[PDB]
Design a protein around this ligand. Structure first.
Ligand code: NA
Ligand code: NA
Ligand code: NA
Ligand SMILES: [Zn+2]
Ligand SMILES: [Zn+2]
Lengths: 471, 57, 461, 468, 48
């Protein structure tokens, strides 16, 4: 399934029982945040929550759009009960499948141009802004896709926390935007503004692509076409800047620029490890124009102690390219689950070519561009174990791990400050855990024959799913 | 009215509620903290700011 | 919230979307076994599978009755989507409600006692027997509750013993049973019930072992039992689908197995005992409730998870009130996850030490993870978060050699000995220095009320 | 045996050649502490030292009351030469006995109410206060039993709490105390009444010194130590909910001053070092009741061993043993006499391979052993854990340091252990010195030289021939 | 510091006097020649 905007995806979620509509008016704080947290807490099949009426505001809010494996699968156009492993495999199949350039559409064909605000800009007149967490420095836009650059195909799209500083002004961490990192010096040295676009309420795969780890260099509109199995996405030129292109279906588009030589307190705000960030001086963006759809939807994201929505946004986004890197050099690797705190915890499922090979796979992961500074706990399991099924991984740990020989601790390794347990800060003591069965020439203290699944198991899985679909 | 994070007196009303007279948004010009009229913000001791602390940033 | 037989529970499962009916005829092998495996493989919301027609047989089969947390919750009479932690708490609450003696009812009132076969016993005419796993030594009855009297007081139905043991079919009226799994020296009557109330099977799979405990598990509602037809000191559940009354043949040992075991491997084939079936008593149109087992997780894992966790939790709580919950659901407690409050610096390791010195934890528990009070030890995603953000492997991971072990762990070297691993995944507390303290994103006000409201809105939409 | 007060015990000690009377007048500052240190330094049969005359003080002082295995044995009513292991088993026997509730007597019957000082309360008119250690922050009361009620059930005199607390004399009617080591759940929401008893029956001090982790700090526990005979208690003169021993030499009624912190310390502690000088609580002394010719019973403490070590040795060993024994009947004995249980030697039978480390784990999760015990040595059931050369034999023949020594970091620690780094945190060390048992492989089996037949009878016979 | 006081005078006889400082609660007998080791001596900064 292909989605041209956020609205068709919300429709699909509603048809599948994955979206709750809140009809009674709610207060901005803390109702929306508490409902996001509760939705994340519902266990499995967690739905998106749609607020139709927020006191004092004119429009609607939707939250927890990505916050479930059901919503993730529906985002990929698969049956909502597709296993995490199978979603990983579908994503891997599509990751490099096709180079597809986005189709440029005329302004009259872009729903994000239906309404234009040019002079008396007031973000609160459009987005029902609220406080996401109790100690946040202000009202945040937590799920926006920011577009920065003379080519509409060398454009960079990413996610950055966007703190509302005024009805017309906003905050940003330009230190996390390399494209802006280079241009900021030359712009501030001439007090020449730097154009920027902020898109809110997008097709789920666009948000997904904007969240893809920056190192893998897949944050372009072309990658969205790749994720849609070769179907391109429509883009429209920005109203005020001729080199910035934004998705045609975005609910809200904030065209603006970084104010030169301005720096002010931004934060604190929640971060994916589950704690508040610090308040630091960062950049500020003035909004020069707002284009939006009729009756815009504010698609915002709650984050707290994992797992919340952002964990789903990052899970297979981190897993798949790590798997491709491992697979290029070691074909025995079957799957890679790097879904735990941006890949700090990683579970690799692989075939053991010979004795000790599992630790070799772990070494390769610990030498990849991402796993080297990030992955702190690396578990290796046999090829028949599903690394996305934590019960199975616990079984492998309990029956195959001998802590005297299978648990290796290595100090003085590359680390990352986002891990609060590091000592010294930013340095990692890595832990490798080999939970595979001994293979020659490794001695086996007691060989056993595993209970291999009976014949026809896969056919019966399909059959039972079809029989369940009739209830 | 003073800022709940840095205590400054330089507090400016940001916006009024677009619909009706439900609330107002206040912002401190010194440390950028903002809050709504209807919420009762109690800043944690570790999250309060001071001129000595803003200077360190 | 109380079941008198298997059929009432099955209808509860069907009304809640947790039972599949296979109307078409299926072959005994490998369709029933493969469907058990597939149902387990569905991962979440796994239903029970009910086969109405098996080729060459006259009655029906049901499998994976316990194989889900939804099924587990409905077994306890709770909402099918109740969390695993909440089920842990409910089971812990009912665990100690001792004075619930079972009710003895007349033979005419027992659905078990509708049909009787006392001549030319043929198991295959009642149970659609099939091979569960490829290398199994034969067709197996893998979910029966076996009732035997205690030699300390033979004629006292308040001191009986009920348990689950694999039963291999050796002939039309002869089965195989594991001997060493007192009176077997002096001389033996025995009863094998199949298709029971799910809490009866739960009690049978718990290492107490009386009908009174089932009464406690039903929040004080006593269960009904009946005297065996040939043995006055043996009593069976009144709602049993099938009851085999028989005896152990003396001075007879035959090859039994191989058969799968819960750590996921085949056992060996050993010389074991044989039981002769003297009488079969059953309900009209009986249902063969059988269990698949293979690589975990399968149904047996649910039969062993919380009735292992709860006793360990009570033992820890006796001396350590800060313990919030214990998750000992992995391979009979070889892996344990304890959620506790940290009274002072280092207390997490002390909690782990206490678990490692309990009667079950000492030989079984090899990997012990300790997490904070707010972390759900049954939510492995939260546990992964705790490991990734709280564990400094240089200080929080302790490896202890020369410790008690258990042979069932194939990786033990020397076999039966353990090298324990303790992982302290808690946040530092004074006087432990904190490399850098962080403020957790505490949940917003009104989160629980909103959980209730969202569930209510979803149910009405 | 039963003692109604300290004087009865002093009589027993004197008639056993275990008490020295110092008739000559001595100076407060150097002499008393040096005599305590010397008496400890005697190494064997160390006696209690009684000072009759002190320069400028009307009354007398006694020290080293608990300061030997002879005095310890006499306190329990055993023969004064009973071995430490035998004393351990005797105390283990008595710990079980039913705790008899204390007997409440009337004010007219208590010897501790003979004299009352209510107006000009001055501690120096009664207690000959001195300086225990040179660098001590003042004059110290080091062997007092402090009586406090628990606000969970505050009207029950069977729920009272009696402890040992460092008392620093600060003024005529003011002293210092470590409230945070007592007075915590009841202080934040607050004066708090306190009674401070000096010169009690040795079993009273023994009970007040039992580590708090066992909840044995009640008067009824003394009834167990006296073999089912209760002790006599009286009501406080000022607080109707506080009860003090009937035969105490001196009783100090008073209260904790609200919102007052003063520098307390330093004071030499049991590890043989001075403690820091920290901000602690003050206690105003409001009324003094005492016996005629009161005797200030004070304790010296320095480098071990001194009287404090004897007061704590079996007091710490027996409850640890019983806690282990509840779930591990294989345990034969526990010797935790070294620095309040920082070093522990457990003797046990090994049920199966690895059991020794399990016993160590159980000790390291007991209420006292968890923060205190840093070095835990486990030995076989025949090794006497109180015989250190036998323990050394077990170490040299049974310990394979490659697998029998387990070092666990990030464990609960003890702040007064000077080597802790980070301070207050422990790196535990478990040493398994037991013989391997199946399924653990044995690299070489040996046949121990079991004692000859008749050894016990010959022990008795040799002792009898020695007595002549 | 200078804020000292005479806490007590010797009972029977006139043999000594107990003096005490009012800022750190340190005390001593008149017949003592005390030397507070450098590691023990305290100032106003440490009290804070
Ligand atoms: Na290995
Ligand atoms: Na820690
Ligand atoms: Na050993
Ligand atoms: Zn401010
Ligand atoms: Zn001074």
């Amino acid at each position: 399934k292909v989605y041209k905007d956020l609205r068709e995806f919300l429709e699909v979620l509603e048809q599948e029982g994955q979206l709750i509509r809140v009809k009674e008016e709610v207060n901005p704080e803390p109702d929306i945040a508490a409902a996001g947290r509760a939705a994340a807490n519902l266990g499995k099949n967690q739905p998106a929550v749609f607020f139709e009426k927020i006191k004092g505001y004119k429009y609607s809010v939707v939250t927890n759009v990505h916050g479930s494996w059901q919503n993730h699968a529906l985002m990929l156009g698969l049956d909502k009960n597709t296993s995490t492993k199978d979603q990983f495999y579908e994503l891997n199949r599509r990751w490099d499948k096709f180079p597809v350039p986005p189709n440029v559409v005329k302004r009259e064909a872009a729903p994000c141009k239906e309404n234009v605000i040019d002079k008396d800009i007031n973000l609160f007149e459009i987005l029902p802004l609220y406080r996401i967490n109790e100690q946040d420095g202000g009202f945040y836009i937590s799920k926006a896709s920011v577009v920065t650059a003379d080519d509409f195909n060398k454009l960079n799209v990413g996610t950055y926390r966007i703190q509302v500083k005024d009805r017309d002004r906003v905050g940003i961490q330009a230190l996390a935007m390399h494209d802006i990192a280079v241009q900021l010096e030359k712009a501030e040295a001439e007090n020449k503004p730097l154009p920027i676009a902020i898109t809110i309420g997008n097709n789920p795969l666009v948000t997904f692509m904007a969240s893809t780890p920056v190192g893998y260099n897949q944050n372009e509109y072309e990658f969205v076409g790749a994720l849609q199995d070769g179907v391109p996405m429509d883009i429209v030129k920005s109203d005020l800047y001729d080199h910035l292109y934004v998705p045609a279906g975005s609910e809200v588009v904030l065209e603006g620029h970084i104010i030169p030589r301005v720096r002010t307190v931004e934060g604190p705000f929640g971060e994916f490890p589950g704690s508040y960030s610090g308040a630091r001086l960062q950049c500020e963006v003035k909004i020069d124009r707002i284009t939006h759809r009729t009756n815009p939807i504010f698609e915002n994201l709650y984050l707290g102690i994992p797992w919340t929505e952002i964990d789903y946004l990052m899970a297979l986004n981190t897993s798949v390219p790590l798997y491709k890197q491992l697979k290029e050099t070691m074909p025995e690797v079957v799957a890679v689950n790097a879904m735990y705190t941006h890949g700090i915890g990683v579970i690799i499922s692989t075939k053991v070519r010979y004795g000790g090979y599992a630790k070799g796979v772990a070494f390769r992961l610990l030498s990849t561009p991402h796993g080297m500074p990030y992955s702190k706990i690396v578990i290796v399991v046999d090829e028949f174990v599903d690394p996305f099924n934590l019960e199975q991984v616990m079984w492998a740990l309990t029956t195959r791990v001998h802590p005297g020989k299978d648990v290796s601790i290595i100090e003085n390794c590359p680390g990352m400050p986002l891990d609060p347990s590091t000592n010294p800060p930013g340095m990692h003591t890595k832990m490798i855990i080999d939970a595979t069965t001994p293979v020659p020439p490794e001695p086996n203290p007691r060989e056993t024959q595993l209970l291999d699944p009976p014949d026809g198991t896969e056919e019966w899985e399909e059959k039972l799913k079809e029989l369940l679909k009739n209830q | 009215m003073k800022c709940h994070r840095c205590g400054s007196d330089n507090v400016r009303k940001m916006v009024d509620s677009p619909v009706g007279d439900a609330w107002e948004v206040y912002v401190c010009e010194k440390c950028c903290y903002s809050w709504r009229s209807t919420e009762n913000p109690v800043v944690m001791e570790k999250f309060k700011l001071d001129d000595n602390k803003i200077a360190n940033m």
